[PDB]
């Protein structure tokens, strides 16, 4: 967003530098907002903005966009993760295990080279983590498939 | 495998078996392991007279197997033949297990508190006092009082204090050891209350122990009991000490309680000592005679004339160093700077009028007639609001009819401009007095529905209810926070419901849970100041659970700042550990955490000369952000308070760094505000006085802590910088002998004159206007040997003490 | 004293062994302070 | 005294212990915030990004580049990749607004 307020040109007599209780003022100036914007700090000045609650609506609208990363209904999308559920999610595991072969065949070339150059070139290549997340999808494998014992039986 | 002999019936083979055990068991220590179940045949048989020694050897194999509490159980069933013989090392282990289990069983039974208590065997407590005969016969008081603290019981401990010889005063500093390691106040005061009684039964009376209980046990009837015994004893000269310790180091309601039961010569004396008027007049004479100031720095800040934030800057800085002088030349020396004042500037301008006039209760009202809160209606009206604010800064703690003089003016003139500093004057003057009508007339005043007056009635209602832990007051403050649209009434009531609870420890945690669990950031910050004032003086980790948790996972930097600032409030008793635990916490990415942590290290170690805090504050003033350098300037002036160049080398380095950044226009106005502010801190009271949050007696100073915690954030409310004047306490040696009469006495100090420099053979001091002194120079000084007037009480710290004519 | 001052050698040793433990664990925080400040300055780098 | 100070030495020990679990949980949450910051810098920026005509790297963390509109620039380069793939001569995609070296 942004904020602007026109200072009075009739104030050239008196001083141009209020206010008092500088709390929101000195905190509003930062970043100092570039140059061309604060080039307007002459003849203009910004104003502070705070979000008032209204917590109930802010909380529901919070969960409204949380439907993206959580789930659509908080049920559907990860029951859609129970729809696919390894399907056709092993195809991306085959590409992940192709990322296993690809990335880790050049990861086994790294520690030998570390012994040649003696040692860290800073580095590391990163070439770290990664498929640990694939194993977190394996936690989706074990959990949601363990739900089958609850689904199938009664 | 000698245990196989037990299969035969007659017991004589068992006695011969244990006769084989106790000798060759060195290699057989592990042999009896599997056969312990066969040893149980002897241990469970009552008709076997040697089952005792059977439990001895069973305790030996369990000693080799690593079993401890099991060896203690068999030690109980080992009869008399166990405790009689101690050789090699079997002792230190079993007595460690016995004393441990015993003291934690006593602590277990101490929380009941009474009834249903678990059974205690006579043998395990038998080896308590029996092995304690080693402590009684060898005449070791350090270990004797050690186990006496372990047992958590008042009977055997009453025998430890009853042991022969002396131990003349050693119970005093032993309670200092107790209170240092003390956990809770449950059994603390119960052990303390009997020690002052055994000092009354002792032949030599000592008032420092009843002084320790006066500031620790802190009960209203006890001070009325001991002083009624002083009036019954016809005590005058030597009761002068404990009476001033009652005024100084005890709460206002404590003074109201002792005067209530007493009044139901010395009758006018108790009025003079409890009102503390003589202390104000001698402080006034001490400040006007001994004042050491430098106007050159005030002129270099004067002629700067920067239009931003400088309004409060110079006036609050010179109001600190000049506090109590009444001589003010400021409006004469600086004029055009004061003509630049506008909006809240004239508030602070006339508010400094009360900071520098602090004390001087008599003429403070009529001497301001020129600067009186006019109310000539070319409206400056923050002016006339700050005038009553100035009258409230002087009238804090005790007071007089001027309180009602401000109350009538609150019901008169205009609104809400009067309520700003006026209601602050009404609440600050009634602080700690538990005033009633103020709670009512502030409710109908709270309903006038304005914003800037929000902090006014909030801090006022929080000060009058301080320590009262009332119900309907917090209920109405939390009930008015809904329909109001202002955040200043939320912050004023935040500190208001925070200030009402002081030293509550776990008693306030019921409300602290609700304030912290709530999603309101202002109410969370309210619970931070509330848990700070309740845990002030205590290093318990129950506070640091939620206090530090909201200092971690919270997304709002401001309340997180107030969260890390409470480390200075609660931990101020142990300032040394704060630089170590907050070391990295000043390296955080956001300047808010680096700021509040810098204030934490500043206010916590302020009473100490530790160089580690100054070392960690060195990169703080180098940080790119402005206000973190500012807080680094204020906190660095808090660590150097009264400390000259001989204390730490960074004094003059920071002093020149202050005038440098304020005379440098390139630096930010924010960051340079704490520079001139630091010049006021370091020079506060003309260097004669400083801030003290911890008295020598061991009790925390309420108006200094309350003063600095409301002083924490000066940005939201500029006049909050004036509240730090309450935190200033005089440091001086008062040679008053008694009453009005002033003797002429000079005594010697062993320190070099380099320590006496305040920018050898004997020091030259009053002779009580008293003379300033450093807390580090109080131990080296000695009472005059050849002078006619010599103190009857050993001289250690400064202040006002008895001086006896010899 | 055997209760005692010779026993305090064992008592204080428990807090000495836990001192060395807590000291070892204190360093466990200290180097992760260097790593915390590392990625904290790197957080100042992504802010920069 | 001996037992006194012995009971005084576990205070700061337990205080440092609660500081351990504290700073552990602290740098655990701040770590996830740094992972969130990694999601920011990897999201930054564009998509769509204008590629431009690169000349040389002048010194540490910065370099000079012409755009595809042919004007030499001076920009502090993207932090995580300083050199290895930048090379003397390439075509570097420049930030939408800033024309930053990425």
UniProtKB/Swiss-Prot annotation, chain A:
Q: In which tissues is it expressed?
A: Widely expressed. Highest levels in heart and skeletal muscle.
Q: Care to name a GO molecular-function term for this sequence?
A: K63-linked deubiquitinase activity
Does the keyword Thylakoid belong to this entry? no
PTM sites of type Phosphoserine? 68
Q: Quote a single Gene Ontology cellular component term.
A: proteasome accessory complex
Superkingdom is Eukaryota
- What are the BP-aspect GO terms? double-strand break repair via homologous recombination; double-strand break repair via nonhomologous end joining; proteasome-mediated ubiquitin-dependent protein catabolic process; protein deubiquitination; protein K63-linked deubiquitination; regulation of proteasomal protein catabolic process; response to ethanol; ubiquitin-dependent protein catabolic process
The alphabetized UniProt keywords are: DNA damage, DNA repair, Hydrolase, Metal-binding, Metalloprotease, Phosphoprotein, Protease, Proteasome, Ubl conjugation pathway, Zinc
| Phosphothreonine carried by residues | 110
Record has DNA repair as a keyword = yes
- Protein's job: Component of the 26S proteasome, a multiprotein complex involved in the ATP-dependent degradation of ubiquitinated proteins. This complex plays a key role in the maintenance of protein homeostasis by removing misfolded or damaged proteins, which could impair cellular functions, and by removing proteins whose functions are no longer required. Therefore, the proteasome participates in numerous cellular processes, including cell cycle progression, apoptosis, or DNA damage repair.
Q: Which family does it belong to?
A: Belongs to the peptidase M67A family. PSMD14 subfamily.
The name under which this protein is listed is 26S proteasome non-ATPase regulatory subunit 14
Organism equals Homo sapiens (Human)
UniProtKB/Swiss-Prot annotation, chain B:
Q: Does the keyword Calcium apply?
A: no
Alphabetical list of InterPro entries matching this protein:
26S_Psome_Rpn2, ARM-like, ARM-type_fold, Proteasome/cyclosome_rpt, PSMD1_RPN2_N, RPN2_C
Tell me the Pfam families matching this sequence.
Answer: HEAT_2, PC_rep, RPN2_C, RPN2_N
One Gene Ontology term from the biological process aspect of the record? regulation of protein catabolic process
Q: Name one GO molecular function term.
A: enzyme regulator activity
Q: Which residues form a coiled coil?
A: none
**Keywords assigned by UniProt?**
Acetylation, Phosphoprotein, Proteasome, Repeat
- Which SUPFAM superfamilies does the record match to this protein? ARM repeat (SSF48371)
For the modification N6-acetyllysine, which residues carry it?
A: 665
Which residue spans traverse the membrane?
Answer: none
Leader sequence residues? none
Give the family this protein belongs to, as stated in its UniProt record.
Answer: Belongs to the proteasome subunit S1 family.
The protein here is known as 26S proteasome non-ATPase regulatory subunit 1
The organism named in the record is Homo sapiens (Human)
The lineage is: Eukaryota, Metazoa, Chordata, Craniata, Vertebrata
Swiss-Prot record, chain C:
Name where it's found.
Answer: Cytoplasm; Nucleus
User: Family, per the entry?
Assistant: Belongs to the AAA ATPase family.
Function as written in the Swiss-Prot or TrEMBL entry: Component of the 26S proteasome, a multiprotein complex involved in the ATP-dependent degradation of ubiquitinated proteins. This complex plays a key role in the maintenance of protein homeostasis by removing misfolded or damaged proteins, which could impair cellular functions, and by removing proteins whose functions are no longer required. Therefore, the proteasome participates in numerous cellular processes, including cell cycle progression, apoptosis, or DNA damage repair.
**Subunit structure, as described in the record:** Component of the 19S proteasome regulatory particle complex. The 26S proteasome consists of a 20S core particle (CP) and two 19S regulatory subunits (RP). The regulatory particle is made of a lid composed of 9 subunits, a base containing 6 ATPases including PSMC5 and few additional components. Component of a complex with USP49 and RUVBL1. Interacts with PRPF19. Interacts with TRIM5. Interacts with NDC80. Interacts with PAAF1. Interacts, in vitro, with the thyroid hormone receptor (in a thyroid hormone T3-dependent manner) and with retinoid X receptor (RXR). Interacts with ERCC6.
**Under which name does UniProt file this protein?**
26S proteasome regulatory subunit 8
Organism per entry: Homo sapiens
Please name the gene that encodes this protein. Answer: PSMC5
User: Which portion of the entire protein is included?
Assistant: 11 to 58 of 406
UniProtKB/Swiss-Prot annotation, chain D:
The subcellular localization recorded is:
Cytoplasm; Nucleus
| Quaternary structure annotation from Swiss-Prot or TrEMBL | Component of the 19S proteasome regulatory particle complex. The 26S proteasome consists of a 20S core particle (CP) and two 19S regulatory subunits (RP). The regulatory particle is made of a lid composed of 9 subunits, a base containing 6 ATPases including PSMC4 and few additional components. Interacts with NR1I3. Interacts with PAAF1. Interacts with TRIM5. Interacts with ZFAND1.
What is the protein's known function?
Component of the 26S proteasome, a multiprotein complex involved in the ATP-dependent degradation of ubiquitinated proteins. This complex plays a key role in the maintenance of protein homeostasis by removing misfolded or damaged proteins, which could impair cellular functions, and by removing proteins whose functions are no longer required. Therefore, the proteasome participates in numerous cellular processes, including cell cycle progression, apoptosis, or DNA damage repair.
Family of this protein: Belongs to the AAA ATPase family.
In Swiss-Prot or TrEMBL terms, this protein is called 26S proteasome regulatory subunit 6B
Instruction: Tell me the lineage of the source organism.
Output: Eukaryota, Metazoa, Chordata, Craniata, Vertebrata
Write the span of the intact protein that is present: 39 to 140 of 418
């Amino acid at each position: 967003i942004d904020a602007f307020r026109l200072i009075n040109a009739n104030m050239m007599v008196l001083g141009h530098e209020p206010r008092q209780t500088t709390s929101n003022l000195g905190h509003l100036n930062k970043p100092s907002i570039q140059a061309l914007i604060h080039g307007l700090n002459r003849h203009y000045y910004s104003i502070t903005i705070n979000y008032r609650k209204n917590e109930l609506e802010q909380k529901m609208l919070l969960n409204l966009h949380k439907k993206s990363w959580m789930e659509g209904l908080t049920l559907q999308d990860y029951s859609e993760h129970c729809k696919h559920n390894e399907s056709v999610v092993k195809e991306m595991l085959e590409l992940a295990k192709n990322y296993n072969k690809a990335v880790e065949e050049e990861d086994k070339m790294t520690p030998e080279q570390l012994a040649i150059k003696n040692v860290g070139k800073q580095d590391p290549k990163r070439h770290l983590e990664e498929h640990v997340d694939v194993l977190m999808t394996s936690n989706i494998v074990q959990c949601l498939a363990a739900m089958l014992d609850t689904v199938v039986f009664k | 495998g000698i245990i196989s002999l037990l299969d035969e019936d007659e017991p004589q083979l068992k006695e011969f078996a244990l006769h084989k055990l106790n000798a060759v068991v060195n290699d057989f220590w592990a042999e009896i392991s599997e056969s312990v179940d066969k040893i149980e045949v002897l241990y469970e048989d009552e008709g076997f007279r040697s089952r005792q020694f059977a439990a001895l050897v069973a305790s030996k194999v369990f000693y080799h197997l690593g079993a401890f509490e099991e060896s203690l159980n068999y030690a109980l069933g080992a009869g008399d033949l166990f405790n009689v013989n101690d050789n090699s090392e079997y002792v230190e282990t079993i007595i460690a297990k016995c004393i441990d289990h015993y003291t934690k069983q006593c602590v277990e039974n101490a929380d009941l508190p009474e009834g249903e208590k678990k059974p205690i065997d006579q043998r395990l407590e038998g080896i308590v006092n029996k092995m304690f005969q080693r402590c009684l016969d060898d005449h070791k008081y350090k270990q004797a009082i050690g186990i006496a603290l372990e047992t958590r019981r008042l009977d055997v401990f009453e025998k430890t204090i009853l042991e022969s010889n002396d131990v003349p005063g050693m119970l005093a500093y032993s309670l200092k050891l107790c209170m240092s390691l003390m956990q809770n106040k449950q059994f603390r005061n119960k052990v303390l209350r009997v020690l002052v009684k055994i000092y009354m039964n002792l032949e030599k009376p000592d008032f420092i122990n009843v002084c320790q209980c006066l500031i620790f046990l802190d009960d209203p009837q006890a001070v009325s009991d001991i002083l009624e015994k002083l009036v019954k004893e016809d005590n005058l000269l030597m009761a002068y000490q404990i009476c001033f310790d009652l005024y100084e180091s005890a709460s206002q309601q404590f003074l109201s309680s002792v005067i209530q039961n007493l009044r139901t010569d010395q009758t006018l004396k108790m009025i003079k000592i409890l009102s503390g008027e003589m202390a104000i007049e001698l402080h006034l004479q001490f400040l006007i005679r001994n004042n050491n100031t430098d106007l050159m720095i005030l002129k270099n800040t004067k002629d700067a004339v920067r239009n931003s934030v400088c309004h409060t800057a110079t006036v609050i800085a010179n109001s600190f160093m000049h506090c109590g002088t009444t001589s003010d030349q400021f409006l004469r020396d600086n004029l055009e700077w004061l003509a630049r004042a506008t909006n809240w500037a004239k508030f602070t301008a006339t508010a400094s009028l009360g900071v520098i006039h602090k004390g001087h209760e008599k003429e403070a009202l009529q001497l301001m007639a020129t600067y009186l809160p006019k109310d000539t209606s070319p409206g400056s009206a923050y002016q006339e609001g700050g005038g009553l604010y100035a009258l409230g800064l002087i009238h804090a703690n005790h007071g007089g009819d001027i309180i009602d003089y401000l109350l009538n003016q609150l019901k008169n003139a205009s609104n809400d401009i009067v309520r700003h500093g006026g209601s602050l004057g009404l609440g600050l003057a009634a602080m700690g007095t538990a005033r009633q009508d103020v709670y009512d007339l502030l409710k109908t005043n709270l309903y006038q529905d304005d914003a800037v007056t929000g902090e006014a009635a909030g801090l006022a209602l929080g000060l009058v209810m301080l320590g009262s832990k009332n119900a309907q007051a917090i209920e109405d403050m939390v009930g008015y926070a809904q329909e109001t649209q202002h955040e200043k009434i939320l912050r004023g009531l935040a500190v208001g419901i925070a200030l009402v609870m002081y030293g509550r420890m776990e008693e306030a945690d019921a409300l602290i849970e609700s304030l912290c669990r709530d999603k309101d950031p202002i109410l969370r910050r309210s619970g931070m100041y509330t848990v700070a004032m309740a845990y002030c003086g205590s290093g318990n980790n129950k506070a640091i659970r939620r206090l530090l948790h909201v200092a971690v996972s919270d997304v709002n930097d401001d309340v997180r700042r107030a969260a890390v600032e409470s480390l200075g409030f609660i931990l101020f008793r142990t300032p040394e550990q704060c630089p170590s635990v907050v070391s990295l916490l000043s390296e955080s990415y956001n300047p808010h955490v680096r700021y509040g942590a810098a204030m934490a290290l500043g206010i916590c170690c302020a009473g100490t000369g530790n160089k580690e805090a100054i070392n960690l504050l060195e990169p703080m003033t180098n940080d790119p952000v402005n206000y973190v350098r500012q807080g680094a300037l204020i906190a660095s002036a808090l660590i150097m308070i009264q400390q000259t160049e001989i204390t730490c080398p960074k004094v003059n380095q920071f002093r020149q760094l202050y005038s440098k950044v304020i005379n440098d226009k390139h630096d930010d106005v924010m960051a340079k505000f704490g520079a001139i502010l630091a010049q006021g801190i370091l020079d506060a009271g003309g260097h004669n006085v400083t801030i003290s949050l911890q008295s020598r007696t061991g009790h925390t100073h309420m108006p200094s802590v309350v003063g600095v915690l409301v002083f924490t954030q000066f940005w939201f409310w500029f006049p909050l910088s004036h509240f730090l004047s309450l935190a200033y306490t005089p440091t001086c040696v008062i040679g008053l002998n008694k009453d009005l009469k002033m003797p002429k006495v000079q005594y010697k100090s062993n320190c070099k004159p380099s320590t006496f420099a305040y920018p050898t053979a004997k020091a030259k001091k009053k002779e009580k206007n008293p003379a300033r002194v450093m807390p580090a120079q109080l131990k080296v000084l000695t009472m005059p040997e050849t002078c006619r007037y010599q103190p009857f009480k050993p001289l250690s710290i400064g202040g006002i003490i008895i001086l006896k004519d010899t | 004293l055997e209760e005692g001052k010779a026993g305090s050698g064992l008592r204080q040793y428990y807090l000495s062994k836990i001192e060395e433990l807590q000291l070892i664990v204190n360093d466990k925080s200290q180097n992760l302070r260097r790593l915390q400040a590392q990625r904290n300055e790197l957080n100042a780098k992504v802010r920069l | 005294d001996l037992y006194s100070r012995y009971k005084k030495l576990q205070q700061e020990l337990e205080f440092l212990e609660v500081q351990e679990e504290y700073i552990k949980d602290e740098q655990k949450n701040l770590k996830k915030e740094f992972l969130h910051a990694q999601e920011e810098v990897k999201r930054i920026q564009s998509i769509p990004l204008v590629i431009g005509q690169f000349l040389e790297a002048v010194d540490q963390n910065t370099a000079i580049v012409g755009s595809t509109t042919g004007s030499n620039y001076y920009v502090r380069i993207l932090s995580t990749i300083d050199r290895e793939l930048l090379k003397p001569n390439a075509s570097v995609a420049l930030h939408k607004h800033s024309n930053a070296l990425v």
